Symmetry: D2
Subunit: 485 residues, 4 copies
């Protein structure tokens, strides 16, 4: 009953050119909807709308913005089934995956609303007499939000909700493979009645709409989640106008398993961590590193549970374990990873088959550091297991990557857990849990090739505000020039 | 006098032996021979800093603080040497360089004081049986690239605070002030910091600086200089995804309302607009005065400008203004004066120049198309603009690409606060100079003036990252495989 | 049918004892309410104590969920709360509307903040040591409240204390029990776990004193008279329980000579006489600069004369309702008589009928007047004329109290100097003395009490810090010294 | 030895004095004042008069004074060490540790003075600026004990001064000379008259005056719980706030997966350093049955190795004497009670003069006095438990709640125990008496209220002050008739 459209300055509308393209399901290639194929003029219009809305939005008290976010939360709760349906048919997520995403998104919107009134500046001691010295927080301005296709709802809403809460306005460009999710977000914002221009949606190609957002002089900041190469490109283009950036660029997270673990539990945890959403998670456990003393048993248990994984049309029922990859390019790339691993002498323990956009888990042992699946982020269900002889070697292998997003160690020893946690080079780390733990208000982000900045709660606020030192001087004084006086 | 690099605990020549002669802006006399380092020297410094990093980051903060207190002790005995060099090399007056050295003492002390006290957070977890905390970790090897106007205080704010939280440093000072950089390295050497923790490489920005900015073992670059340079650094830094702190100058407004002590306002204005010959990022570069007091203000302001004593800054302690740093600065100031005259400006006083000296040139009858309204004027050429009301004052104040600091003079609390809120700047001062600065406050700008903040814990924020760590104390069941 | 609420159950007091609650408007019966005794208090306290571990141990987000539930139920009960605040407490429509709106914000604020109360990760001075600070709830908290703003003061204490994982035993003022019962209705409908919140309606020296002396009560938060607070503080020492005390004030409202005098008078009337002056942060001592004193006094008295005193049930435009009981009228009469007897000039008012007191305004008072020496919790107000800012501050500070204060002026220097010099826990420039927001630190100094309430400050009061370390290396110990 | 009041060393107004003797051999140490209420009152009035000037200078000026105090202290280290030993009974190693920690304490206070921040808040109203300033409380009473008289005093004094309070200081009666050396240091550091004051006299006279005087804003106290309750009650009269650290009966929990020999070594240090006269001494040792036999054997072995001697003799004396005869008498009561109740005395119990050999008991139950009371001396129970639940139940079966520790290599057991133990502080795999200059030190339950150390000391002796500026006019709801 409704066409998919851009949302610009309070109005749903076609791209100026009228150009469109067809979004199909990764599940079966069926048509989902025609969606805009916007261009630079559409991006410019959204940016100008956001810019004209900015002062009114930034200057209302925080409690009024919080109220809008609470309304958004109420609208979101009414739309939950709609979001789950689209996350499954457009993104290929299983019932359990998209249920988790929608529950987390509810917490994210609520978290941003909760915190809006409480973002504080500081009162300082002055080293001078008769001086009041304080620091205010101010919003950065128009913020470009550019997002990926794997968790398109929760990742988008983490960025959008928190950015809006502290008084920025938004121009949002969803991933091209998940446009309907972005349009549903715009439906939600529109129903919550936010002032026109405060939130804008532009559906179109990254190299056109995204680039316009990243280079426009009225955009103050870009928050971006996607590939490291795209991130470096955006960071470079952002420099033209000195806009700041938040970049979350994926990972090759280590899951380190020591010899004192419950091996069956370790395997269960490892399967979930390494293969949930077909391993298409930035904090997926992408490199599994196991102590030689439990390695044989761990590998057997891990393969045992992998064998049980059910791959199917994610619309069929609520207990499907894995759906398809997002498109044919991903399948082609996973095939390259498997073929490379086998050519280099790796032992394919299980899996390897694919059909349409579906790709089975493919598990390797006997790998070395020159394997593509050890050197690159593997955004799909191909996973190496590396056996190490001690903790020193576990750490060396864990750190032998350009990435540095998250990581985890399983052990019951407090000394080994803390030493390894300290030594692993990552922006996040989890003792006795999955690598992709995430809460709405914690600093989420990485180091090294995994990006810059942190998002979540007040950390999102830190990214999209600045400090403003203000003083008041209550006495007159003599000045050193002209000295003759 | 021969100057050297300081790399991995050793003072040494550039690997090519290449040197160049540095002269005083005061009279052109030879001051020193200094390195012309190349990319190999930069790489050696970076490798040394990288190799020193883990040992320096991992000792307790109290130990790093001890090194900084020792550096403070060494600095206190070198005060006179720093002042002399800031005058003869940088052209600063006694009062200017005295102020810089006093502030530098405070900066080193501030970094030492704070090192033990930079805290992370313990969080509430939304999950049962989960401990959730956030640690602070140092970024790694930090490039420090600095300007010539306040080469000591600006360098030491960056260096001292960056070291405090467990970063190592590769430092490349401005080409016009290499000797101040070498003296900094001397102080650090005497303080006995572990080899590689601090390194000095003297050489051309486009060679040494570019190596620092593009090298994959450098984690962060903190830069103070021109907006165009900063834009280039930010773009180059993207290749390795290193972060940056950029302070790129300003065109700060000084707003003077009609309820002020006009004589005091003029005295304040002269100091704020012309101290160190206006060569200050937060100089009061655009003076904006309310119609009702404009005539009297302008008369007083020119009166006090006329009293300024311009002279060899080495002569005595009461010289008001010294020379500009080089002939290019003189040439630029002449362009600003030429443009203002050509567009109908009235030159109330000044414009005379001889050698590197320049008598402050003050213009009225200016409009928004004047170069001295549109560009940063990093020298002693100043426009005075008259406005009819507070709305216009704000409009003119914000009519700039820059956004560093700003100030308003008024006794009215409502006008003061409304103007402070409306002016688009990273910092703002009510009833004081535009260039107020303390050791521990967030210093920095918005718009074309740059990104990030420096000073105390804000410097720490720039050169550390947050690290979320959890411990889960209970086992649970996972959603896949569902057949379980 | 009004009753206690203990361990998830509405019930009669154990003795079955009751008393009648009457309206201050006309003495009409409102409801029979419990007259509980110590055994009722002990049952409540034991219920809270047994509920504590389960409530403190759930994740913060679950407690926030319960408070958001409470907020939903409150929004349904708004009309009920306003009706009772008026007929039981004597508040006008505008007063009770304001209290209900603020209460909604208070419950929301507590819910908002629950998940975000953080501890700290520290630098250790020792090697191989992790050092952090957690926040822990104190335990069972006694909540004892007054009659003037019984809903908003109760809910500020109750909501924030529950948010961070304490359980609550609540005893409302004897003159406002139905409000306390409606709160219990709200909590019950929100479905909080049994024992987490308990209501005991009864005499302060019986029920209240049991709460304050019981070994399983960890904290008491109290708002009321300074004498009562001092007794509670003393009694609380027996078990080393901590206390938050808000004990009223005698706030100065300082009016300088540069104000809009008409506006100052309008502000002063609102600040000094809203809710018949029965506000801890009422402007109880008006201090005006001699240069505007005559016009101010004329305008102030003019607006006071315009105040409509009537049955607050009559309509929404009634300005002033009755005092809470006849004992308050008798006290205000003593204040008026003492002022008259001491030579004070009664400008207007001072009549009373039933529980309704007509605002009595005095000039030509001195420091020995009871209305200058004591908190006047009613509509009797002194105006003092002063010659300069020094005198204003001397008179402002000449009080045992120190809760809030305000200054009206357009001069930024005079505003800040006066704000700094006035000895109070809170201070407002160009606004009323009783400004209050849900998340700011509300509280006083001197005889006005100890501690702060509001958002995270409420959390600070009812939690404690817990330093935890992990040492990751073994070491040698100094005894026995003989040992290797 | 004299008082230090308003910048001047002087004897009490009465001229009264008393002779202090060494706990080591009873020899004379010094004549010290016996001050009265008038001396306390004079100190308080001096601190009150000095307060505005001290509170109002920039924090950097107060920091400079503390840095100067630090330099003076560094020159007086040997003096402090001698007096802590001969007046306090501390061994060389104990007093060396105290002096080192005191240096760090003074430096920590100086470091933080410029950095104590308030907050800028979001306002729920339009056109409103809303901020929170930090202000000093005023005149602060500092009342201290005899066991670590230097470090405990200086942690309180240095941090309290740093944020702009003035100080009236009353040291414990058994350690007045240490108190006088502190006044000496402060005098040489040149602090303004009245900012710091020393009054030496009996707690029930000088202390009570401090606690009840109307111009004293806050009292920070360390000592016995009974005294603390006394002070908290008297303080209520003038609504002054208090900080109280009132000792502990800390559990040291030792699980079955430990290096048992290491555990014993750690336990001996934790339980008996300074003769157990430490608020955070490991006073109740709780050990898992699977390692208990071996642990008890190793622990008694190391206890037997302890060298008890004149602490003045050399640097390797492990234990000195208890502070006085009353402490010895109390320790005998604890031993008597444990024997009467069926405890097995594995070693120790001998006493001569103020010296006492650590008495170690097994076979104890919860009704023993040494399990129910704080044992501020070298008598220690070892209790055996069957599992972690039982370890926790025993650890919490105390009125106190100061510190605590668990020894284990298991992360789950360490954390669950840490969470479950009811204490203000807790340490995994270390001694119970860990202490740093800037961490929140203090207890729950009977162990007291408040925290001290760095910014936590600042919180105790400052208050928040909410200030607003409203930038627009508005209509008010009364009189409602106004248009
Ligand atoms: C001279 O140079 C002055 C410049 O003023 P300024 O020092 O305030 O600002 P600036 O020109 O922007 O330069 C500041 C710092 O950046 C360095 N730099 C220049 N180009 C660089 C690059 N491509 N990469 C990295 N670093 C680079 C400079 O080194 P160099 O000084 O060697 O160029 C200097 O250390 C002019 O006033 C003129 O008179
Ligand atoms: C002796 O005294 C020792 C007590 O140990 P302790 O010093 O750790 O704890 P404490 O008895 O509680 O004494 C601590 C501090 O409080 C003082 N004090 C005692 N009663 C006081 C009161 N009513 N008001 C104010 N201050 C008071 C003490 O002074 P005094 O030393 O003068 O009592 C001392 O300065 C016993 O162990 C025994 O050996």
């Amino acid at each position: 009953i409704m066409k998919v459209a851009n949302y610009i300055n309070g109005e749903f509308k076609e791209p100026s050119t009228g150009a469109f393209q067809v979004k199909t399901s990764p599940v079966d290639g069926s048509k989902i909807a025609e969606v805009p194929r916007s261009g630079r003029e559409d991006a410019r219009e959204a940016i100008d709308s956001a810019f004209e809305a900015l002062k009114a939005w930034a200057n209302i008290p925080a409690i009024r913005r919080a109220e809008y976010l609470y309304k958004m939360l109420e609208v979101f709760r009414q739309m939950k089934e709609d979001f789950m349906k689209i996350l499954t048919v457009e993104g290929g997520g299983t019932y359990r995956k998209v249920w988790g995403e929608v529950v987390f998104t509810e917490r994210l919107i609520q978290n941003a609303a909760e915190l809006a009134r409480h973002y504080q500046g500081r009162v300082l001691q002055s080293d001078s007499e008769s001086t009041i010295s304080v620091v205010f927080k101010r919003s950065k301005g128009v913020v470009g939000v550019i997002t990926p296709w794997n968790y398109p709802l929760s990742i988008s809403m983490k960025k959008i909700a928190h950015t809006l809460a502290v008084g920025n306005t938004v121009v949002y460009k969803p991933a091209s493979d998940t446009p309907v999710t972005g349009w549903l977000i715009a439906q939600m914002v529109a129903k919550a009645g936010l002032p026109k221009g405060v939130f804008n949606l532009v559906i179109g190609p990254g190299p056109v709409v995204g680039e316009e957002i990243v280079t426009h002089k009225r955009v103050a900041h870009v928050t971006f989640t996607g590939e490291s190469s795209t991130g470096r490109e955006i960071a470079a283009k952002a420099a033209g106008t000195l806009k700041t950036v938040t970049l979350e660029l994926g990972g090759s997270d280590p899951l380190i398993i020591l010899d004192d673990v419950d091996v069956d539990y370790a395997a269960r945890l490892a399967v979930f961590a390494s293969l949930f959403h077909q391993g298409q998670i930035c904090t997926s456990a992408k490199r599994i590193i196991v102590h030689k003393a439990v390695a044989d048993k761990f590998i057997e248990r891990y393969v045992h549970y992998v064998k049980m994984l059910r791959i199917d049309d994610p619309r069929k029922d609520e207990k499907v374990d894995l759906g398809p990859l997002i498109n044919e390019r991903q399948v082609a790339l996973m095939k390259e990873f498997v073929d490379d691993a086998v050519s280099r002498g790796g032992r394919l323990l299980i899996g390897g088959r694919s059909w349409g956009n579906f790709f089975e888990p493919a598990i390797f042992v006997d790998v070395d550091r020159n394997f593509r699946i050890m050197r690159e982020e593997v955004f799909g269900p191909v996973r190496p297991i590396v056996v190490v002889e001690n903790d020193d070697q576990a750490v060396e292998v864990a750190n032998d990557t350009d990435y540095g997003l998250s990581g985890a160690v399983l052990t019951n020893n407090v000394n080994r857990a803390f030493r390894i946690a300290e030594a692993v080079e990552s922006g996040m780390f989890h003792i006795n849990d999955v690598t992709f733990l995430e809460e709405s208000h914690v600093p989420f982000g990485g180091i090294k090739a995994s990006g810059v900045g942190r998002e979540g709660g007040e950390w999102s606020f830190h990214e999209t505000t600045y400090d403003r030192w203000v003083t008041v001087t209550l006495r007159t004084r003599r000045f050193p020039i002209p000295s003759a006086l």
